[PDB]
Amino acid sequence: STSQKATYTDDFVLYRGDDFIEIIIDEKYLNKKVKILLDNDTIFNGILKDTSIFIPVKEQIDLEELAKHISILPEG
């Protein structure tokens, strides 16, 4: 029941689209090998050259909780 369209953390900004949810990673992780995980499932694992990672949205979940669930993990 939340109408919030966007939220922010120290690593990324979540934006709510029409049929997707976009993770805008901070530019500091650019051109670096990262591993972006939603909960304990891998959604990205490689060299981050594009700061935008799109994931499907189904149930209009609270964006704060989703931001609490997403995590960025650099390697090195």
Binding site: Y8, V13, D26
Partner: protein, 496 residues
């Protein structure tokens, strides 16, 4: 920071989304304020500006004087006026055949200022706003939530500047240009704009509805907004009668700008909300009378509230008329003596006969000297009240009922040297004198009959209230039938 990064990447939709979610770091504010100065190259920038301003105005923890003066180059007085003065949002439609983005119901946010008029949108012509400033005699700051061409917004901005209350601007949109001396100027594409506005569930005001800003101000900030209620016995003469009432309202100097269509558009009313039909009424049927009186109550309460747009009930004048005197008595009893109104009498012209706009509670006052009525009293415990103010003389049947129903007392009231039937004129004194006679001779239980016009009975009901234990008898044709509703029942308590 995130805002510097997003702005570098021209991610204005994400910035607007962050602003609408009210999730904004204070350290970001400066950058946000800078967005207000960027060129309106596309709709994303303009909508971001609009939402930034609305956030600054609604969550004033982000409203910062240092940024208002240093970043926006605003002088101190204008910045402080933006901080303190409240804003208004008005709706205006724009139809562009070439571009569907420009065809929309846009919003304009307006803050009144003292000695400066400006906007943060680069596509707006300054002289177009200066025209509004000259016409309304008010400086203002204005911002828009969409990029468009033309000056069809002048009427909406003038309405936002003139309206004292912001409620009426939520359901009403405006389109049209404004002249320097306050003239509303016609604009193009009225049909598509009306379609857009009704698609957004709002009513549209066109330049053909109102002539100038003064007429608009009559509707926006009325001192005595006139609404209509006419009870009729002929349904197929409903609309015509309404038009007659409209004409009867236009004859008043205070309501020279009144138009039925303008009232219906401004305050979201239909024809059915202003009249009541009783095809065949049985005054001995309690349930039918209960239903009719509840319908009357509902319609009058709607006319006095107008879906919450009206705050002061005394700022609305109910132009009321009826077609049955017996029913008009109960109409007046229910209406009370606190609501500003005007009671009319239909003699093919709906002549105004009683005026209670300024001071409504002045019917309850009595007179020490009778000047228009003649009274024949005999004060006993069961009082029989007879009123003779029409062509037909009900005195004979009145006394026949008096002894037939075992009524001891007698109290006949009629006109003084007017030979029965009464002429058109000011009837407040007649009603006041009748109420004086009734209240000064009040008894434990009394009965009343009458042959009088609808306006006299309605005003008498407004004067009496529900405090007197009177039983009413309706005269159909040579015979009287008891109305099973006493005038002092709790169901008739006036809520106005």
């Amino acid at each position: 920071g995130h805002i510097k990064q997003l702005l570098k990447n021209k991610r204005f939709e994400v910035i607007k989304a962050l602003v609408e979610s009210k999730k904004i770091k204070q350290e970001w504010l400066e950058d946000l304020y800078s967005i207000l100065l960027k060129q309106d190259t596309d709709v994303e920038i303009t909508q971001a500006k609009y939402e930034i301003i609305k956030l600054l105005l609604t969550e004033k923890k982000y409203l910062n004087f240092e940024l208002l003066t240093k970043t926006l180059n605003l002088d101190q007085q204008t910045a402080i006026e933006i901080m303190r003065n409240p804003f208004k949002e008005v709706y205006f439609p724009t139809y562009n055949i070439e571009n569907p983005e420009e065809s929309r119901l846009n919003k304009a946010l307006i803050i009144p200022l003292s000695n400066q008029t400006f906007t943060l949108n680069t596509f707006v012509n300054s002289q177009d706003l200066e025209t509004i400033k000259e016409a309304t005699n008010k400086n203002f700051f204005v911002i828009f939530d969409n990029i468009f061409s033309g000056k069809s917004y002048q009427l909406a901005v003038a309405a936002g500047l003139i309206a004292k209350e912001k409620e009426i601007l939520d359901n009403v949109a405006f389109t049209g240009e404004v002249s320097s001396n306050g003239f509303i100027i016609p604009v193009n594409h009225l049909e598509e704009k009306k379609e857009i506005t009704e698609k957004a569930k709002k009513v549209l005001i066109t330049p053909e509805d109102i002539e100038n800003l003064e007429e608009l101000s009559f509707w926006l900030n009325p001192e005595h907004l006139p609404v209509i209620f006419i009870h009729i016995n002929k349904p197929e003469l409903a609309l015509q009668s309404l038009k007659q009432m409209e004409d009867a309202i236009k004859k008043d100097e205070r309501f020279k700008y009144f138009k039925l269509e303008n009232l219906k558009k401004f305050y979201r009313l239909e024809d059915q909300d202003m009249y009541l039909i009783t095809p065949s009424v049985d005054f001995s049927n309690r349930e039918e009378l209960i239903k009719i009186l509840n319908e009357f109550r509902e319609k009058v309460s709607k006319l006095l509230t107008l879906e919450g747009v009206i705050k002061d009930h005394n700022k609305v004048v109910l132009n009321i008329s009826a077609g049955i005197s017996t029913l008009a008595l109960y109409f007046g009893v229910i209406l009370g003596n606190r609501q500003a109104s005007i009671i009319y009498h239909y003699q093919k012209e709906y002549h105004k006969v009683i005026d209670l706009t300024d001071n409504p509670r002045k019917i309850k006052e009595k007179k020490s000297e009778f000047e228009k009525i003649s009274v024949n009293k005999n004060i006993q415990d069961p009082l029989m009240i007879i009123i003779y103010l029409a062509s037909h003389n009900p005195i004979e049947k009145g006394l026949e009922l008096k002894e037939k129903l075992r009524a001891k007392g007698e109290l006949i009231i009629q006109s003084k040297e007017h030979q029965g039937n009464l002429e058109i004129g000011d009837w407040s004194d007649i009603v006041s004198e009748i109420y004086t006679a009734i209240d000064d001779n009040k008894q434990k239980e009394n009965y009343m009959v009458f042959s009088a016009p609808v306006a006299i009975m309605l005003a008498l009901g407004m004067a009496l209230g529900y405090f007197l234990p009177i039983k009413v008898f309706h005269y159909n044709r040579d015979e009287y039938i008891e109305v099973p509703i006493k005038l002092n029942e709790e169901i008739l308590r006036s809520p106005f």
